[PDB]
Design a protein around this ligand. Structure first.
Ligand SMILES: Cc1cn([C@H]2C[C@H](OP(=O)(O)O)[C@@H](COP(=O)(O)O)O2)c(=O)[nH]c1=O
Ligand SMILES: [Ca+2]
Length: 129
């Protein structure tokens, strides 16, 4: 896979970010994760975590997988990076998202993320407390 440029437009919630990609706005839904909805427990915490990460980065990048690049709602499906650090991984490592939506053919970073989740569970962080 490869990283491509994007420019932050707005953080939306724990696992969706609006960003300019190839000069057009699009809403990105993070691959392989599920944060709680804002109205749910740890939702506001997941939202704030992703928001800080993307807003504080000098750059953000998006990385598509090998399969579907957009979902049925028109959202881009990608791994997002904030100054080289993957947001998807970071959310899972902090127990603010579960590994989820792991579809065959779009799951390059599955094992990286499961390893994060196991570490978060060990430490009983957030969702795992
Ligand atoms: C993460 C992901 C979500 N989706 C779809 C499946 C779910 O459809 P349903 O809306 O019909 O439940 C929805 C989950 O997104 P959210 O967690 O943002 O609600 O997005 C994909 O199709 N591919 C993906 O890789
Ligand atoms: Ca969600």
């Amino acid at each position: 896979l490869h990283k491509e440029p994007a420019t932050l437009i707005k953080a939306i919630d724990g696992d969706t970010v609006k960003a300019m990609y190839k000069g057009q706005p699009m809403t990105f839904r993070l691959l392989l994760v599920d944060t709680p909805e804002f109205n749910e427990k740890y939702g506001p915490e997941a939202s704030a975590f992703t928001k800080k990460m993307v807003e504080n980065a000098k750059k953000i990048e998006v990385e598509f997988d090998k399969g579907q690049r957009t979902d049925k709602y028109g959202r881009g499906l990608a791994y997002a990076y904030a100054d080289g650090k993957m947001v998807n991984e970071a959310l899972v490592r902090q127990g603010l998202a579960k590994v989820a939506y792991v579809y065959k053919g779009n799951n390059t970073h599955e094992q990286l993320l499961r390893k994060a989740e196991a570490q978060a569970k060990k430490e009983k962080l957030n969702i795992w407390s």
